[PDB]
Amino acid sequence: VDFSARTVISGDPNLELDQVGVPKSIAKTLTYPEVVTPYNIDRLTQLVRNGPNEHPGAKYVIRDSGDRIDLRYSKRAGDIQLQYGWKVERHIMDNDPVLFNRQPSLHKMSMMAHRVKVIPYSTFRLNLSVTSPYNADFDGDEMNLHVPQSEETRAELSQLCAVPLQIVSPQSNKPCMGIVQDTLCGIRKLTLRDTFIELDQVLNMLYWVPDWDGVIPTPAIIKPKPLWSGKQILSVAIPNGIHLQRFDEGTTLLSPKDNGMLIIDGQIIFGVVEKKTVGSSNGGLIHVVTREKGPQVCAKLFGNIQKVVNFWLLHNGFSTGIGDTIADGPTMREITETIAEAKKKVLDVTKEAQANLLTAKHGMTLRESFEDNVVRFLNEARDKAGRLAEVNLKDLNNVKQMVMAGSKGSFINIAQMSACVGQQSVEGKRIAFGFVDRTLPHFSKDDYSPESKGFVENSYLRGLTPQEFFFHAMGGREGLIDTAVKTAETGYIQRRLVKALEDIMVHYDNTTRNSLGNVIQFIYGEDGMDAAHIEKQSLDTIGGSDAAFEKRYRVDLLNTDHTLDPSLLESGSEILGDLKLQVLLDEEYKQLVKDRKFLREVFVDGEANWPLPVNIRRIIQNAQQTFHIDHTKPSDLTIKDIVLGVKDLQENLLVLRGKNEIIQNAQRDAVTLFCCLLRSRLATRRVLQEYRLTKQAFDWVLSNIEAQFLRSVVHPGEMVGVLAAQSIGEPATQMTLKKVTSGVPRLKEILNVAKNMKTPSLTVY
Amino acid sequence: DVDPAKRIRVSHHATTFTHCEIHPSMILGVAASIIPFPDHNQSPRNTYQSAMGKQAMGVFLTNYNVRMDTMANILYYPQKPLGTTRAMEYLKFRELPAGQNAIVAIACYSGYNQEDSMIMNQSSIDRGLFRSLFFRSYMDQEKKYG
């Protein structure tokens, strides 16, 4: 393996998302052959002079004939006149695209192209947001850096593997990179209402964002003191033209709890910024910027945001101690009694069962249902003991502050530290009677109490008792054991999957085939769409009562009541009673009604949100800000404009082009679901009364959807098989842990097509 | 009438006791006997520690200067841990320690200590914090049957 290097990695808040810090010493070892050209005769000349020992240098100069002049040993190392055509093997310099990768690599996102940034001290350095797609942490991980050796090869990397081009991944059709750890924790604190910054600090923060225009935003407060909002300055890192709407539990347009999120023209208007906004979440800010501004601009976003928050976090500070794991004096009494209560419920089920009064649940032993109840009881305790502790912790509580932001920590963690640790267990049951009729020699025989059989009342804070300790080690070992297993079994499955699909590719006829040329799918994914361009969207027409459906979509020009009020439309009053148009409006409505029927068949469930291409709701929100559309004046749209316009757009959303009848039908099928979404978003009443689009904004919305759509089609040449294998295998290397077979053992049963399932079940309605 | 800070324990409803543990902390082996407050730690974590103690540097022996072994790592200034164990005595840990008491601050600082990395005091490094000796020794003989 030539032209590669490996070393320990370290995170770096000052590198850009797509850069890789390459220690200077490793940069002198890896070379790149570059032909002598007038565009570089000087740079190269200069390098050769520096030689193999100085950085911007080179190790060899190769002349026409193919002669290799060694710069480290050569009486002419300082007397060389490079000539056009020669090649100079120079050291890798700043900005060369290099392939950085971390094993085991079961993802494509685990082998991405980076831009070199030569630096001092050893160890490679990564931006903290490129950490998750590599599943790397800096407790000793090492990574490989491969140097593309040719000109075509260089391009291939920076045009295909470049980190920015991988932000939105096809594996789950959402970003695979987001703001994390420190920046996440800080971005929240920085966005609270109670966060203000003074002139002197604002200026540094502003100056920290490298894409700042030097225009000091006007204070949110000018009064007794020029004071800025935490939200204000962050909004500087966000580029113009970015809009984003999200409503949480009880978010109003006055979100009392500073809930949700509203961003308009790259300026946050309300809502704390946390994992739901700046994380690798679906509709999140990173997803939006990528799609609206491009991969390069989004990549810069990560660094801009990082730099602002990190700076602000460096001067605010954040920490965590034992204090944060301590629960109120009273809460501890409430928690103790909560368990003490579970030991009564369990004690009574015992006396019951010991009297032979418990009734076995059909298809279960007395002892089976006995255990069942004790386990339900104890867990309810553990749970309620945990919530009591959760509720208490103030907002000062650092553990809770991390949780509220998204970075590390969950309920289960807080609960085991502060309230009850829980019930240990091996093979889905309570600690077994290893000794004859007892768990430990310290108990008496036939003791099924919780203390005997493994329930750990104490929290980590309080400490475990010797018996609780051993039992917790028994449970502990079970996890270690199959972390070993799970580990192995998945590294072999992922390889079985790749092998089986590795040759499937999308061809120019939008077909998916294998090496023999056999058709696997007549159109990839049954829609010709590229997974990385699909977003969960709501198919409105499917939910709600019928009354709601008609109120929303029904336009009856022939009815003084169910018509378009002359205020929504310019030609509103002269359209009342118009028969010819009403025939157009009835084609549309009947079409909406079929759509609803149709959808109710495809999703018998009633589920409305499904990943589809082209986020229409966004295209509209743009239009409504781009054309400063005031919701007061009527629209200058004609009913013919909308109905015929939206009817024509559909004929332009192409996935297939063949001029024959067979392919044309394939084409109508591929675009069916999307068109259902389309027609429900651009239904006449919606456009006019809800969106309020003008003839101009509307015409823009249409051509945009057509553009985004075509930009969403999968490109022939896509190694869709390996893509699939890796999309299934990667997460299958994340399954570590209600009575059936799941996880790897099940996935393996499936892939094996095993005729002897372990849990053959029949579900009959 | 019970200290709320203590951990909760069960009763002594036993008039049958035939024996009594000398001390429960004795269920532990040598490695774990060096972990402070192992009973407040998550289970698998005690295990990971028991593996890493074997990768720490200390003073494997006092006669280290007289042995010519393949590899050796000696801490410049070994310290005894401020927080110890009763078992630690029979382990000669305070005698042949393997670590130092670093003054550690749990904080988000320049952001250069995320995802498990650490920010260390360059100044403390100068004064000797954590320096160590490393001894590698090579061997080689002469001919055979010829």
Partner: peptide
Amino acid sequence: IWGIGCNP
């Protein structure tokens, strides 16, 4: 660690 229907 946690209990039944959870991790050991």
